Ligand binder design. Structure first.
Ligand SMILES: Cc1cc(C(N)=O)ccc1-n1nc(C(C)C)c2c(-n3cnc(-c4cnn(C)c4)c3)ccnc21
Length: 212
């Protein structure tokens, strides 16, 4: 016999409101999602590198500091993989929950004053820009001080965390975009390449696009 370990969490109300705004909108410049996820990845890589400066054993889980983009037409997935710090279970639930809460509030006050939705990175919640293009987002992540986890939401008011039974990563994060049917251009090579070139030109880590 096998074991799963699964918990369902309700988003705080304003967060729910923002996620719905993002998933429903018809905003015409959605490619900013890729910039935002890549920037999250780069920050994650900045943090592990910094930690390694003091303690080199932090990289025993892997020394390569990189970002990969993996489109999958059959599964209609676009995957962004990094070997950054990753997130513990407590990060996914409580700690990022606290950040998402204040960030959302500030973001929402800012939108009300006429800020654009592309401004989202400033409020520490850029990850939610995923739902511009994604019906579901699955985040697989592994931090040095904790086990491998899967956080998942469909922007319907709740989210799940679980112990990922799946293939082990060493350290880092995998953000799986289950794309909307109207958003499959983000599986095209030419399209990903030009978004990266345009928005993520000076990212200090190697970005590799896997061509199918
Ligand atoms: C911080 C982060 C880093 C990376 C990376 N290292 O690639 C990828 C994704 C994310 N994010 N960011 C967030 C929120 C701050 C928006 C996030 C996240 N999360 C989103 N909402 C929550 C939340 C809201 N209420 N509660 C209780 C938890 C956690 C789950 C997984 N990865 C996440």
């Amino acid at each position: 016999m096998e074991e799963e370990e699964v918990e369902t969490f309700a988003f705080q109300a304003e967060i729910a409101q923002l996620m719905s705004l993002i998933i429903n909108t018809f905003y015409s410049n959605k490619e900013i999602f890729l910039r935002e996820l890549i920037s999250n990845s780069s920050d994650a890589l900045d943090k592990i590198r910094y930690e390694s400066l003091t303690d080199p054993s932090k990289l025993d889980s892997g020394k390569e500091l990189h970002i990969n983009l993996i489109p999958n037409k059959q599964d209609r997935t676009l995957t962004i993989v990094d070997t950054g710090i990753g997130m513990t279970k407590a990060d996914l639930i409580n700690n990022l929950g606290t950040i998402a809460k204040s960030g959302t509030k500030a973001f929402m006050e800012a939108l009300q004053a006429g800020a654009d939705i592309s401004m989202i990175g400033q409020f520490g919640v850029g990850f939610y820009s995923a739902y511009l293009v994604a019906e579901k987002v699955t985040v697989i992540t592994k931090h040095n001080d904790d086990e491998q986890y899967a956080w998942e939401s469909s922007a319907g008011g709740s989210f799940t965390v679980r112990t990922d039974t799946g293939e082990p990563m060493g350290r880092g994060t995998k953000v799986i975009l289950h794309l909307k049917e109207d958003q499959t251009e983000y599986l095209e090579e030419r399209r990903i390449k030009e978004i990266v070139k345009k928005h993520s030109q000076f990212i200090g880590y190697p970005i590799t696009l896997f061509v199918e």
